[PDB]
Design a protein around this ligand. Structure first.
Ligand SMILES: CC[N+](CC)(CC)Cc1ccccc1
Ligand SMILES: CC[N+](CC)(CC)Cc1ccccc1
Ligand SMILES: CC[N+](CC)(CC)Cc1ccccc1
Ligand SMILES: [Mg+2]
Ligand SMILES: [Mg+2]
Ligand SMILES: [Mg+2]
Ligand SMILES: [Mg+2]
Ligand SMILES: [Mg+2]
Ligand SMILES: [Mg+2]
Ligand SMILES: [Mg+2]
Ligand SMILES: [Mg+2]
Ligand SMILES: [Mg+2]
Lengths: 346, 346, 337
């Protein structure tokens, strides 16, 4: 490990400090925590009430308004995901992440037709801040909400926020193609475009205040993408149970994105079998971005731009670590209101 | 846009040429102003006294009533611009009696409300059959002279008006946390819009088969719905105040209170929803009217229907402007403020 | 900067909601319109026809009976000046005010000899209501009217009426002194406040609103009230100068013109623009003194019946000045081409 660089807003941490410990954490990357956990959790509690108004307003006949976001019983998605987030950017960071969670929740379980309708309505807002034209307002209350947030982000760092908004619109395109369910190698390629990892990294950039040519960021992708692949397969491992229940409960199994699904269906593996295969791809990826890190850190310049690039890879590594630990116990994936193992082996 | 037909007793007027200009008018429907505003205002002042007499007679151990007159015009003159000039007297009585009766029935308890409802219905049934079963309350006792007056002018039209009045009595005899969808069903039936239409029918002398009037109800009703919501919007402040100092806060049902309770909308978030719903309604009666004119032939059947529809549109037009500045709603003697009505946000 | 208490007969307004808009309004105190303008303008349209018949009775020579009173194209002096005037007192409140106007007209432009004649005469009708014995009646038809009027007033409320009448006679005493205008600005402001009728206006407001407050309690707030009334007089001098100059020229009484603008121009050689600017400043100073003084009084005030009346008293005045100002900014009495 030995993450180079100074940390001004976080402290090194361990699963050991948390109790009760998570049932199945097996990450190999380190992670930290912001000193700003309670502010983040306070913001996630207000944004929920917010979001739930918007959701009720688009569909007043549905009553389940249960959404699982950043706050868990041990900590918070933001505090672990982006430990070096700037204190006055914690708030807006929490809104982005949580909105990302909720928006995902009401778009990746519906029929590709209901998804297209909503995906378009969002892109209107985002494109509104990238072009010189006049604004186009979204029609769904769940997307209207996003406008005031994009202004906040851009008022903190416009250069950073414009680019994060760019890769957000890239995520939108990625999850609009999620209409069928593919080989394994064809799935790993589809899932990196659909998970929101590229957008996740740029939310870190804006969060941390990192200014860095797209060239330099690409100059390290070859291994950083292996790390990012790891986090996706990691998400599939932890979010598979709840995702089954949901796509079964909704009649969308058709479009269900998860490597357990792929490994257990095409290939005839079992849940345990596919799980075992996944645990090891996750290791491989975790190990390649970490290794890619040191390899980079020892043949490198002492330039101002070199120091920033290290800051950007440390931000990525730390984020996979923190979300790995977050994912291991988060309500969003480990809810006891869920289908079973025998039920999903069918 | 275009209202078809000739006008004989009224002139078109701009929310603009009025002085003092109302604070908050946003109606999208046209309205006219009778040329006999003066006459109506005189009747209102005389009927005020008669009502006061009756109301002191009926409760000698206890107020103010805010009827049709405003600093800028008169309810009847706007609500019923084309009222036949010799029917303004009795129309002004009808409306003012409606305004006052509502005050002494929608603020008391179900027990009291029922008794007064009961006693007034005795007066209506009497002229709708049989032996006259006369009213015992001084406040209800006064509609008798009124009714003979109405039927003397026009028996066929006054009876139908009388039928729908009774229907309104049935209306306002019925929940708090119902759904806005369920609230609009109830409120349309309890706001007396159908009665209001038939008062206009009597006023203008409209002879139109019941089956003909129902033919266009599918779009007329959406403008009436708009009007009840528009009423809700202007009367929420005074209505909250009244029920506050009575104890009867749960007694009140109002589109804003329901939006503020169902969803956790603030009053300001609710007035904005209500406004768009009011516009949706105003637009709808107008698009229905246009559709109907595109199909309707040039006979007499069609001439009368056109007057009826144009009558309703103008009625909604004028009451909105009336409603935007009448002391009944914007009286400046409330002990409660925006801060107090924020407490119902849940 | 918010007046407390409940408003029963009036609605807030301001210049923005008015059209056509007055060209030269610079008021800083708030104002309201009564809901009973219809009544007010009806009594005005009737009183006028009944006052020119007494003036023509008094002078059958008299040519023009033009008298610009309480009605304007945007409102009415009473609806604005006395917004909370009890509904059944609006009629009589209008008689009192139009009479005050028309009587001003036929006495404050003639020579002083003619003015005492008319003043001493009306004084007979007042005094006769302030005494229990000696009842003298007026001999002029213009003054004969006030008999029945004072009857209506005293019938609606004796205690308020009587005080109003004292201050009325007090107004007659004051304008009986405006014989010259060779004074300093200091001299003028003290003489004018005594002769502009503001004190009587306040009591007309007390009777119209039915305020029951002791004279000792009204004096605890004179120190700031009076700076508002002074301002209200300079405001009148400001808007009513052009028409006054005109008539005093007309009447050959150019040395009786009571007007701070005149005194700034003639005795200090300011120019209109200069003198108007000076006036606008003094008005704001007064306008702010009453409002600051009331704010400061309200904050240390307790809730007793006596203090709610005092609050009513001060608010009425503040609204009265605010209301009369908007009125003076467009009324025919001063803007009539
Ligand atoms: C919409 C995508 N996402 C990715 C985790 C929900 C699955 C939101 C999100 C983006 C970036 C960081 C955190 C959450
Ligand atoms: C406007 C509705 N209102 C007001 C008091 C009570 C429901 C009676 C009314 C109905 C129809 C015409 C005029 C008045
Ligand atoms: C001179 C008296 N005044 C007012 C200043 C006419 C100019 C009559 C009046 C008295 C009280 C209130 C309103 C008018
Ligand atoms: Mg999902
Ligand atoms: Mg998804
Ligand atoms: Mg998943
Ligand atoms: Mg009602
Ligand atoms: Mg009511
Ligand atoms: Mg209402
Ligand atoms: Mg004068
Ligand atoms: Mg004078
Ligand atoms: Mg003057």
């Amino acid at each position: 490990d030995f993450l180079s660089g100074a940390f001004h807003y976080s402290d090194s941490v361990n699963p050991s400090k948390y109790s009760p410990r998570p049932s199945d954490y097996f990450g190999t990357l380190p992670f930290r925590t912001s000193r700003f956990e309670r502010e983040a959790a306070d913001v996630t509690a207000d944004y929920l009430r917010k979001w739930q108004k918007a959701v009720k307003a688009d569909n007043p006949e549905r009553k389940d308004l249960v959404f699982h976001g950043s706050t868990t019983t041990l900590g918070h998605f933001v505090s672990w995901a982006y430990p070096e987030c700037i204190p006055d950017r914690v708030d807006l960071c929490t809104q982005i992440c949580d909105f990302g969670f909720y928006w995902d929740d009401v778009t990746d379980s519906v029929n590709v037709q209901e998804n297209a309708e909503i995906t378009q309505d969002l892109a209107l807002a985002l494109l509104s801040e990238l072009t010189l034209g006049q604004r186009l307002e979204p029609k769904l209350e769940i997307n209207k909400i996003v406008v005031q947030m994009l202004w906040g982000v851009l008022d903190k760092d416009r250069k950073s926020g414009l680019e994060m908004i760019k890769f957000w619109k890239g995520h939108l395109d990625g999850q609009a193609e999620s209409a069928h369910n593919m080989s394994f190698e064809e799935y790993t390629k589809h899932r990196l475009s659909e998970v929101g990892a590229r957008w996740a990294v740029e939310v870190g950039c804006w969060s941390l205040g990192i200014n860095l040519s797209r060239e330099k960021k690409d100059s390290v992708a070859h291994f950083v993408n292996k790390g990012l692949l790891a986090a996706a397969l990691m998400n599939d491992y932890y979010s598979f149970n709840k995702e089954f229940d949901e796509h079964q409960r909704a009649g969308s199994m058709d479009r269900l994105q998860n490597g357990l699904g792929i490994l257990m269906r095409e290939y005839g593996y079992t849940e345990t079998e596919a799980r075992s295969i996944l645990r090891e791809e996750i290791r491989k990826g975790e190990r390649a971005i970490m290794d890619g890190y040191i390899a980079w850190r020892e043949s490198a310049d002492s330039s101002s731009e070199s120091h920033e690039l290290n800051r950007y890879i440390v931000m990525i590594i730390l984020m996979i670590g923190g979300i790995t630990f977050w994912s291991s116990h988060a309500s969003r994936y480990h809810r006891d209101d869920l289908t079973t193992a025998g039920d999903r082996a069918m």
